[PDB]
């Protein structure tokens, strides 16, 4: 199952998805959390 | 008759004090640690 948006995983075969860093968003899944592009802000940990 | 002897020079005016300087700004904060450590791939079964 893909990690729900707001978390990420960077290792093959991990049961738990780590929460994304503060000031970063994630889509459905994603190996690494992609930081906010240009002039925006997340302002919360594990924000979608 | 000759004129009276002139009087000696008068003392000079007192000087003013000097204000103290304001406190300097605090040092710039350090940036966060360089990335997370490499994650473990995880193994075994964890089954019954």
UniProtKB/TrEMBL annotation, chain A:
Chain ranges of the Tyrosine-protein kinase ephrin type A/B receptor-like domain: 1-26
Protein name per UniProt: Mastigoneme-like protein
Organism: Chlamydomonas reinhardtii (Chlamydomonas smithii)
Included range, full protein: 1708 to 1755 of 1997
């Amino acid at each position: 199952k893909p990690c729900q948006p707001g978390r990420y995983q960077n290792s093959i075969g991990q049961r738990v998805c780590k929460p994304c860093d503060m000031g970063t968003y994630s889509r459905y899944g994603g190996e690494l959390c992609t930081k906010c592009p240009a002039g925006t802000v997340a302002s919360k940990t594990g924000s979608s | 008759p000759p004129p009276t002897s002139p009087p000696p020079s008068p003392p000079p005016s007192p000087p003013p004090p000097r204000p103290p300087p304001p406190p300097p700004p605090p040092p710039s904060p350090p940036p966060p640690n360089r990335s997370p450590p490499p994650p473990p791939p995880a193994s075994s079964a964890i089954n019954p």
